[PDB]
Write a protein that binds this ligand. Structure first.
Ligand SMILES: *[C@@H]1O[C@H](CO)[C@@H](O[C@@H]2O[C@H](CO)[C@@H](O[C@@H]3O[C@H](CO)[C@@H](O)[C@H](O)[C@@H]3O)[C@H](O)[C@H]2NC(C)=O)[C@H](O)[C@H]1NC(C)=O
Ligand SMILES: *[C@@H]1O[C@H](CO)[C@@H](O[C@@H]2O[C@H](CO)[C@@H](O)[C@H](O)[C@H]2NC(C)=O)[C@H](O)[C@H]1NC(C)=O
Ligand SMILES: *[C@@H]1O[C@H](CO)[C@@H](O[C@@H]2O[C@H](CO)[C@@H](O)[C@H](O)[C@H]2NC(C)=O)[C@H](O)[C@H]1NC(C)=O
Ligand SMILES: CC(C)CCC[C@@H](C)[C@H]1CC[C@H]2[C@@H]3CC=C4C[C@@H](O)CC[C@]4(C)[C@H]3CC[C@]12C
Ligand SMILES: CC(C)CCC[C@@H](C)[C@H]1CC[C@H]2[C@@H]3CC=C4C[C@@H](O)CC[C@]4(C)[C@H]3CC[C@]12C
Ligand SMILES: CC(=O)N[C@@H]1[C@@H](O)[C@H](O)[C@@H](CO)O[C@H]1O
Ligand SMILES: *[C@@H]1O[C@H](CO)[C@@H](O)[C@H](O)[C@H]1NC(C)=O
Ligand SMILES: *[C@@H]1O[C@H](CO)[C@@H](O)[C@H](O)[C@H]1NC(C)=O
Lengths: 109, 186, 84, 241, 16, 97, 78, 17
């Protein structure tokens, strides 16, 4: 089963539902509909995605669901990150790449 | 009820009802005539003329439960399994602008739970982040804890003693270089 | 799905895991639960029997992230290099 | 379900709103730690004005209330799920000499703790303020934390003065930095108080102990070196000129 | 709980 | 009584109705917030966000609010222990004269 | 409002409403305070960070047209 | 900091010298 795809870049948060070869793509999050509208600008309506601009790291965190049209609430996602308005995720994997790249470029210098 | 983690848990609530819910939020939900509900890890066998089951309990499940009825709470403590109790008492660094000291008693066993002096006051920590859980309690007053944690039977092997953050982790090398110029200029 | 552990990528599952190893992580004594980009998936049965639930996550909260403007951190990183 | 947001005898209005068109809509108050109790419900206009906003209002604030609040909604009989929302607490004061803005204290463990159990414990203390209407909420990472925290609803009277404590146990990544807080629903801006020993408004206080001030002092040590190092490195520019 | 170790760092830089 | 404006991140909540929240920075329009949000981004409280702020909805405006914070230019605890450190550092650095 | 950085003693001025006495609704005068000034010694950020405001003489808790929130700490030399 | 735990053995090199 090909999984979800969540990317965090700047203030923008996007979710993907590649679990369907077509049909319909509708979103819900915390028992309400999102992404079906387009006239509002901080969220996106996409052919396969839910797009969030200026994602509230404290408020917009919750359960996200993928829909084919006509379905009912009864593959889910629970999403949390710090998005604020310029912050990302410098996870512990890249600690060396953050704190010793300085020494490495210093040695090159 | 007093059990360690990983154990099977069965709980009974005592009282043709139409509405009933077991509150941790609603978890057990009964319909008009449904006999079985299943979700999470839990079982639910119903008889209104009503069960919940945890196959492998965890201390996070420890909570006060209530049952709701309609015309026509009960607390549960779940204990950890530390796999190595290490009972011990220590004092904590008292911050400035306080004329008081605090004591701590932790890492002990379930049966080894914990003032006698005129001016000392004494009181599960299911921190699943550490993949185990422990129990803790504190005593504070005006102060070596050796005479403080003294009212309870600790075992003889108890151990006694004798964003900014990101930034401060950052400029270590800058300080190493102010160490440089101030000595390279010599 | 996933529950709170205040800093953890811990996942709350009632059945064993299926994962792609970009990073190894560590699992609980309850082998259904996993803690730690890599793809890690859960797999559930209680109300989905004859089917399955699935979860793929971005790491819950952050044990290692901070709110910041990189411009208001770029120079404070460049300190140690201008000091060279 | 959404929810937003006191001298003895004061009045206030509470709000809760829904977009689920629920007809069965009620209120709920919880004695912190042991009990939860209910307030009557209204199904529509005329009986007990709009199925959406169902506000709650106080007739007379009393110190004996001492509980948190909940407003719940659900459809009648289709499933039975009594969905809940967030909550807030009340504080009624025999004010002036009894009420103070919270003084909050937080500590750090010993070296032998971390050495022998490898997993430290952090604790926050707050001295009480008559009556026993006290709150406490830890705050790390940008959220109120409910996992791995102890809470005792009664501020322990000492003689009178009070104190209450909570534990937050946990380090290979010192990026972790802690804080302690207490939410005080104190007197409103529109109630009387004598400016001598003046009035604390509804406030949230902060306590931090993660090296409590050692990191901050080591940081300030920079400005204790950077400017003068730059000055000695730049005074040579006279010769360059 | 590292400030001690920066202390030995300082004394060792001194003797160095 | 009016006053609609009230980790280390600091955010201000305007208690106005959920139809328009508008934020005035130093007495001027700076930004607009939607109904799904309820907080205004100031960032970390340590990044000197000092200023006077006030929010507006469908009404006129609320009581203005002001706060000051800093990057900790004066954030110290000068006990004899830290006294030894900074004093010795100063003297050893200046001994070059 | 105006502030000072130096030392463990902090100082701030409230120039609002001159010509009549000034009263503070939070952390008013251990503490010295003049007709338009407040002086605080040994300021701990732990228990003294909150809302602050200055009121004129003959005023009630509702009359304020300005407000202040703060969080600071000592420097002992600065 | 702990980065210099193996560098704590600049005690070692002077011992060799
Ligand atoms: C709730 O929020 C937004 C905040 O932006 C309001 O939307 C927009 O507000 C601007 C303010 O300039 C309106 O601009 C319009 O420009 C022309 C000038 O000839 C004229 O149509 C109007 O006099 C006005 O100045 C803009 O129309 C307005 N709406 C949109 C869709 O952009 C929004 O109106 C707020 N809701 C309410 C009910 O006010
Ligand atoms: C949950 O675990 C079980 C056991 O691995 C999985 O069952 C397999 O599912 C596949 C289809 O994905 C079937 O073709 C296999 O026959 C099943 N296994 C066996 C041993 O017969 C199940 O798929 C898992 N869930 C997910 C989402 O992968
Ligand atoms: C309820 O607990 C019982 C413990 O036996 C489990 O019963 C199994 O249920 C499945 C269907 O879910 C049956 O096909 C099996 O025959 C049952 N087991 C046995 C040994 O007879 C059941 O899994 C539990 N429900 C949960 C954990 O949700
Ligand atoms: C204050 C810190 C964090 C920044 C600068 C580092 C200080 C503590 C270190 C870096 C280099 C060190 C100096 C290096 C060389 C010598 C010569 C020796 O015969 C006496 C000590 C003395 C004079 C050291 C004193 C302390 C020193 C200045
Ligand atoms: C960074 C390298 C060069 C070290 C040079 C500066 C040294 C001497 C300084 C830097 C940090 C300082 C420590 C910072 C905080 C504390 C905690 C306090 O309760 C006792 C003093 C103590 C332990 C200080 C001792 C001196 C110290 C170790
Ligand atoms: C739990 C208990 O019995 N503790 C006692 C303690 O009170 C007493 O001070 C000590 C003297 O050796 O002996 C032990
Ligand atoms: C309820 O009764 C059952 C009967 O077997 C018992 O096993 C279980 O422990 C009880 N649960 C309680 C008292 O919480
Ligand atoms: C105008 O602002 C005041 C500020 O106190 C507020 O009370 C009032 O509701 C506002 N609107 C009016 C008078 O229409």
């Amino acid at each position: 089963q090909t999984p979800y795809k969540v990317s965090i870049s700047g203030t923008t948060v996007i979710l993907t539902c590649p679990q369907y070869p077509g049909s319909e793509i509708l979103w819900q999050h915390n028992d309400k509909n999102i992404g079906g509208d387009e006239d509002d600008k901080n969220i996106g309506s996409d052919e396969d995605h839910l797009s969030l601009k200026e994602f509230s790291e404290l408020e917009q965190s919750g359960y996200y669901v993928c829909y084919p049209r006509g379905s009912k609430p009864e593959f889910y996602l629970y999403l949390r990150a710090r998005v604020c308005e310029n912050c990302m995720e410098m996870d512990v994997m890249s600690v060396a790449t953050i704190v010793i790249v300085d020494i490495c470029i210093t040695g090159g210098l | 009820l007093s059990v360690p983690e990983g154990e099977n848990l069965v709980l009974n609530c005592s009282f043709a009802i139409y509405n009933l819910q077991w509150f941790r939020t609603s978890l057990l939900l009964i319909q008009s005539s449904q006999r079985e509900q299943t979700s999470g890890r839990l079982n639910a066998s119903l008889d209104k003329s009503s069960t919940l089951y945890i196959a492998a309990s965890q201390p996070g499940d420890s909570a006060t439960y209530l049952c709701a009825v309609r015309p026509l709470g009960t607390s549960l403590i779940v204990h950890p399994y530390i796999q190595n109790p290490d009972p011990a008492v220590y004092q904590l660094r008292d911050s400035k602008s306080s004329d008081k000291s605090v004591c701590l008693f932790t890492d002990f066993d379930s049966q080894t739970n914990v003032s006698k002096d005129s001016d000392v006051y004494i009181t599960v920590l299911d921190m699943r982040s550490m993949d185990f859980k422990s129990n803790s309690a504190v005593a504070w007053s005006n102060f070596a804890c050796a005479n403080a944690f003294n009212n309870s039977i600790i075992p003889e092997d108890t151990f006694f003693p004798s964003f900014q953050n990101l930034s401060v982790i950052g400029f270590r090398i800058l300080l190493l270089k102010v160490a440089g110029f101030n000595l390279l200029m010599t | 799905p996933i529950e709170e552990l205040e800093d953890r990528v811990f996942v709350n599952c009632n059945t064993s895991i299926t994962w792609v190893e970009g990073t190894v992580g560590t699992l609980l004594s309850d082998i259904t639960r996993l803690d730690l980009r890599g793809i890690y998936r859960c797999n559930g049965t209680d109300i989905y029997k004859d089917k399955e639930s699935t979860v793929q996550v971005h790491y819950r909260m952050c044990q290692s992230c901070v709110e910041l403007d990189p411009a208001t951190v770029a120079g404070i990183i460049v300190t140690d290099v201008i000091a060279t | 379900v959404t929810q937003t947001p006191l001298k003895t005898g004061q009045s206030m209005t509470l709000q809760c709103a829904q977009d689920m068109n629920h007809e069965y809509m009620s209120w709920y108050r919880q004695d912190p730690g042991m009990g939860l109790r209910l307030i009557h419900y209204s199904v529509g206009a005329g009986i007990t004005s709009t199925t959406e906003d169902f506000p709650l209002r106080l007739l007379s604030a009393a110190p004996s209330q001492t509980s948190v609040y909940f407003c719940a909604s659900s459809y009648v009989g289709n499933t039975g799920e009594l969905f809940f929302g967030e909550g807030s607490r009340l504080t009624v004061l025999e004010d002036l000499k009894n009420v103070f803005p919270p003084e909050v204290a937080v500590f750090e463990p010993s070296e032998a703790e971390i050495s022998h159990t490898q997993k430290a414990t952090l604790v926050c203390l707050a001295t009480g303020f008559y009556p026993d209407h006290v709150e406490l909420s830890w705050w790390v990472n940008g959220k109120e934390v409910h996992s791995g925290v102890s809470t005792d609803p009664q501020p322990l009277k000492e003689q009178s003065r009070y104190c209450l404590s909570s534990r937050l146990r946990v380090w290979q990544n010192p990026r972790n930095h802690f804080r302690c807080q207490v939410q005080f629903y104190g007197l409103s801006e529109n109630d009387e108080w004598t400016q001598d020993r003046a009035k604390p408004v509804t406030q949230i206080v902060s306590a931090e102990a993660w090296v409590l001030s050692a990191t901050i002092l080591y940081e300030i040590l920079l400005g204790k070196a950077t400017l003068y190092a730059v000055l000695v490195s730049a005074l040579v520019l006279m010769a360059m000129v | 709980l590292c400030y001690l170790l920066d202390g030995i760092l300082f004394i060792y830089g001194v003797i160095l | 009584g009016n006053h609609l404006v009230k980790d280390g991140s600091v955010l201000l909540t305007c208690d106005a109705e959920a139809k328009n929240i508008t934020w005035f920075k130093d007495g001027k329009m700076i930004g607009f917030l939607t109904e799904d949000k309820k907080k205004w981004n100031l960032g970390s409280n340590a990044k000197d966000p000092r200023g006077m702020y006030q929010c507006k909805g469908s009404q006129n405006k609320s009581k203005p609010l002001q706060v000051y914070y800093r990057m900790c230019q004066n954030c110290i605890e000068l006990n004899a222990a830290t006294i030894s450190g900074f004093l010795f550092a100063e003297i050893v650095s200046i001994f070059v004269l």
